[PDB]
Amino acid sequence: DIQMTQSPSSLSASLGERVSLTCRASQEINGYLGWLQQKPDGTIKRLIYAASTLHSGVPKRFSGSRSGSDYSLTISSLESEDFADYYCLQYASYPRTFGGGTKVEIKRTVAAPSVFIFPPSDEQLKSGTASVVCLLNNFYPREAKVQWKVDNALQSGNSQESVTEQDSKDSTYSLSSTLTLSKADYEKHKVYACEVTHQGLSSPVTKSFNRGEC
Amino acid sequence: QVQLQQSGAELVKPGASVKLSCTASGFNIKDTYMHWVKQRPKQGLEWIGRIDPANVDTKYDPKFQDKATITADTSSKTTYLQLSSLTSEDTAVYYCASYYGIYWGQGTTLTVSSASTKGPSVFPLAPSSKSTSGGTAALGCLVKDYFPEPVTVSWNSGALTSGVHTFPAVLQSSGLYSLSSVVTVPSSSLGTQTYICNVNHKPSNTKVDKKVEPKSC
């Protein structure tokens, strides 16, 4: 079974940038490779077939190349609607194999995150569960770091981060980190802090509150 | 135009089997034969197998043999992806593609879980923490312990769109889902504007509205 090694995995480019994606074959698939694209939310579209043959209607800013085992997809002018996922599909032999895929995101200047922290509601505590959330709004690049600390005690394996998709308008990101304790544990701790680390911040900022049920 | 119709979202229990369909409009399976691909949540595309009804041929990647079964009804221009002995590992999205992958269908979501349809529990992510108006504030709604997906979160019945962030759902250890819809609002409005989150969850037929107000927390 021929294996397609796609690279890179992630790529951040600016509008009008010339980008190139590569996919190397283990075995000689000689010409039998296609390029696909999956727009956010699901839609998949066949861009190129036969390594360099563009599907009718596919913009001329897309082209396919081959250098030995390496097959490349190249986009001349990176237009906004090119923010999607690309995969190389081998079809020389069965089974058909894909490439890991490349996620091309929009590049922009470093945006320091806006941080907020929310204590659990009284009504929730009544049901035992105590959820705590830390919101990091509109930041970039996506690489963040939320260290939950209760009474300075670093927390682990008790929080779930969730990242919003890059905003169309300003290309920023948003992250929600939810900490989950039990009304028992929760009520036995006072200070609940959230420490965020981002390259857009000189020092790791922290937001906290004291357990004072209101 | 000519496209690929795919079956609806499926929610099955671990152990059973499923049968997904894909119908072609215009072009038939004889000429444009089908491919079935899988894609686990936030992962890559995995080729499962394919069928060439004309030659009564069927291919499968070694990892799907026996576990997946593709059959095509010539008259209906419909192939069928059959998946047996389902486990959590099967929860994913499956797409059908025709000959040469010219056309791809919208994909059907399969969810394998032991859990059941449960309405969400909406809680307020109250503002005014270490503050009292002034500058920019943030509030939202915590939509937790619901199944299956998804939930639709509107703000003020669709009136407030700017600054709203409805994060992707997070699967919890209990097998239930949870998410948050935070909203960035001016701090000055915190007592002169009512913010309501309209959470809807069709599967349970739940429709709730949670009012988030400032608290000196």
Curated annotation (Swiss-Prot), chain A:
InterPro entries, alphabetized: Ig-like_dom (IPR007110), Ig-like_dom_sf (IPR036179), Ig-like_fold (IPR013783), Ig/MHC_CS (IPR003006), Ig_C1-set (IPR003597), Immune_Resp_Modulators (IPR050380)
GO cellular-component term (any): plasma membrane
Keyword Disulfide bond: yes
Residue intervals of the Ig-like domain: 113-210
GO molecular function, one term: antigen binding
Covalent S-S links between cysteines: C134-C194
Protein's UniProt keywords contain Amino-acid biosynthesis: no
GO biological process, one term: adaptive immune response
Subunit and partners: Immunoglobulins are composed of two identical heavy chains and two identical light chains; disulfide-linked.
Function: Constant region of immunoglobulin light chains. Immunoglobulins, also known as antibodies, are membrane-bound or secreted glycoproteins produced by B lymphocytes. In the recognition phase of humoral immunity, the membrane-bound immunoglobulins serve as receptors which, upon binding of a specific antigen, trigger the clonal expansion and differentiation of B lymphocytes into immunoglobulins-secreting plasma cells. Secreted immunoglobulins mediate the effector phase of humoral immunity, which results in the elimination of bound antigens.
Disease tied to this entry: Immunoglobulin kappa light chain deficiency: A disease characterized by the complete absence of immunoglobulin kappa chains.
Name of protein: Immunoglobulin kappa constant
Biological source species: Homo sapiens (Human)
Swiss-Prot record, chain B:
Disulphides: C141-C197
CH1, as annotated region: 115-212
Effect of K211R: In IMGT allele IGHG1*03
Region annotation Disordered: where it falls in the sequence: 115-135
Span of domain Ig-like: 120-213
Chain's role: Constant region of immunoglobulin heavy chains. Immunoglobulins, also known as antibodies, are membrane-bound or secreted glycoproteins produced by B lymphocytes. In the recognition phase of humoral immunity, the membrane-bound immunoglobulins serve as receptors which, upon binding of a specific antigen, trigger the clonal expansion and differentiation of B lymphocytes into immunoglobulins-secreting plasma cells. Secreted immunoglobulins mediate the effector phase of humoral immunity, which results in the elimination of bound antigens.
Disease annotated for this entry: Multiple myeloma: A malignant tumor of plasma cells usually arising in the bone marrow and characterized by diffuse involvement of the skeletal system, hyperglobulinemia, Bence-Jones proteinuria and anemia. Complications of multiple myeloma are bone pain, hypercalcemia, renal failure and spinal cord compression. The aberrant antibodies that are produced lead to impaired humoral immunity and patients have a high prevalence of infection. Amyloidosis may develop in some patients.
Subunit structure, as described in the record: Immunoglobulins are composed of two identical heavy chains and two identical light chains; disulfide-linked. Interacts with FCGR1A; this interaction mediates IgG effector functions on monocytes. Interacts with FCGR2A and FCGR3A.
Descriptive protein name: Immunoglobulin heavy constant gamma 1
Species in which this protein is naturally found: Homo sapiens (Human)
Name of the gene this protein is made from: IGHG1
Section of the entire sequence shown: 1 to 103 of 399
